[PDB]
Design a protein around this ligand. Structure first.
Ligand code: CA
Length: 325
């Protein structure tokens, strides 16, 4: 692959997307979840006492560039998962770009959901104001300061399992074969450490289901999670029924549904009919949109697998365009 290019693997029905990263000298390959909703780079390690037998574990002893650190870390994600351990320093190779002396977080403990998942840890792509340890420079901060990228951007393509899966992240560039038309620039609010944007409105057919609302672009969240009122308005448009757990039951037959269209900075971006269905289990379909008790939306994979995004940490801003398909 080209310089800074990282092919991704689509896990299951567009649940999450991970890529290979080489850590250490001579180095081991790790599958990490690329997450724009967090900013810590943590990996399963041989110090871990409740990690999955299937995860690849970083071993300090096998890296001649490992450097010990006296600090500890602990993280607790919104979904109830967590992990904790110690800090360390080592080299990280991202698509051919060798970051020297990146702060890495070695897990000593991790939640069972991580132990049974497909990845070895997470690569945080949010802003450095939300690293759990103060003073930690993120991989993007280091790519920029070490001169590994000449533009402070990363282009993101997330595939659809229905079309074969895959995905691709490009550090320092983007690929126009993955999108159609012109990119639309959208200003980012990074005040909470996330890629926050304002959606002007959301429509289903001729109905305005929502007025402007704020949301965060999160590759690390599977669904499109909306504030209660907005989610109910959307559900009413499709005849979806509330499962009482943050999810909805929708008709498995999407041939009759109109796309969920977001108006962002004057252009239209949509969640295609096929994406309105997340998963089918014993003939019952779970919708691609859910609700949470937050005042802002979590714009997850349901939305990102339909729209290419160029993330610019420098401005900050994003450039978006409909996926070429
Ligand atoms: Ca996640």
């Amino acid at each position: 692959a080209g310089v800074g290019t990282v092919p991704m693997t689509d896990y299951g029905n567009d649940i999450e997307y991970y890529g290979q990263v080489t850590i250490g000298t001579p180095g081991k390959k790790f599958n990490l979840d690329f997450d724009t909703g967090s900013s810590d780079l943590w990996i399963a390690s041989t110090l871990c006492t409740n990690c999955g037998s299937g995860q690849t574990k970083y071993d300090p002893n096998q890296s001649s560039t490992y450097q010990a650190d006296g600090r500890t870390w602990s993280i607790s994600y919104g979904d109830g998962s967590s992990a904790s351990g110690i800090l360390a320093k080592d080299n990280v190779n991202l698509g051919g770009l060798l970051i020297k002396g990146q702060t890495i977080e070695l897990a000593k403990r991790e939640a069972a959901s991580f132990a049974s998942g497909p990845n070895d840890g997470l690569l945080g792509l949010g802003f450095d104001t939300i690293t759990t340890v103060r003073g930690v420079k993120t991989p993007m901060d280091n790519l920029i300061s070490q001169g590994l990228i000449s533009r402070p951007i990363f282009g993101v393509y997330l595939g659809k399992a229905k079309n074969g899966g895959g995905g691709e992240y490009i550090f320092g560039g983007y690929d126009s074969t993955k999108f159609k038309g012109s990119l639309t620039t959208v200003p980012i609010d990074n005040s909470r450490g996330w890629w926050g944007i304002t959606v002007d409105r959301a429509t289903v057919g001729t109905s305005t289901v929502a007025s402007s609302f704020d949301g965060i672009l999160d590759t690390g969240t599977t669904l499109l999670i909306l504030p209660n009122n907005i989610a109910a308005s959307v559900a009413r448009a499709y005849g979806a029924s509330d499962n009482g757990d943050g999810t909805y039951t929708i008709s498995c037959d999407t041939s009759a549904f109109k796309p969920l269209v977001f108006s962002i900075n004057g252009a239209s971006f949509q969640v295609s009919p096929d994406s309105l269905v997340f998963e089918e289990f014993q003939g019952q379909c779970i919708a691609g949109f859910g609700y949470g008790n937050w005042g802002f939306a979590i714009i997850g994979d349901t939305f990102l697998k339909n729209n290419y995004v160029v993330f610019n940490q420098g401005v900050p801003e994003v450039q978006i365009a409909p996926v070429a398909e």
